[PDB]
Amino acid sequence: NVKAYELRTLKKKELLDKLDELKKELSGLRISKALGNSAKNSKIHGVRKNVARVLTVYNQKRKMELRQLYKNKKFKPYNLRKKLTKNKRLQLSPKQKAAMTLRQKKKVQNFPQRKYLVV
């Protein structure tokens, strides 16, 4: 029934091995079901779940490795890029939006909107 916290520590090969075993077990169960049996029909669900868990663990490991590989370097795969609503991606970064023509900037610096308490 193997829960994830055990599996994080395992190396990828070991994980793969585990997964194959689980798959084999599942296949066996399926075969049994197909044949006139209902002894361990309900065992299958758990096995399936276990398999799923294993897959998840492995997938996340793989993703982490990928991320490590493509750390920085301007361009990246579009997977490892910031998946985010298209419009937002298109949109100008806040900094870009801010960026002021030099005269305007100067003006801002000189005559900023002051605080002035009226009495």
Binding site: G28, R30, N79
Partner: protein
């Protein structure tokens, strides 16, 4: 000729494409299949809708001690492929049936 500075999309996940477990789902019982097993050493397997003959053969080779001379397939109206697998003369389908279950 392409020389991309990084690849566009990189599926780091374990392959979704169907392995032996998933391709070939289970043997068939049913009187027909039993008869087949008995008489002409043909094992009947329900398989994935997207199994080819080659693929099925490969699966059978991997999943069991089976060598297959010929594989006929058909798509059942229940959305499964049924693959009739005739074994080479060296093997007795009955023995292999016993082995599998």
């Amino acid at each position: 000729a392409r020389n991309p500075k990084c690849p566009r999309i990189v599926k780091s996940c374990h392959s979704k494409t169907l392995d032996k477990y998933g391709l070939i789902k289970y043997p068939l019982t049913s009187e027909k299949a039993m008869k087949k097993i008995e008489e002409i050493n043909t094992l009947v397997f329900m398989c994935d809708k997207r199994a080819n003959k080659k693929n099925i053969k490969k699966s059978v080779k991997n999943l069991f001690g089976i060598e297959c001379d010929k594989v006929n397939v058909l798509n059942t109206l229940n959305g499964d492929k049924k693959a009739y697998v005739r074994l080479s003369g060296e093997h007795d389908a009955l023995e292999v049936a016993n082995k599998i279950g």
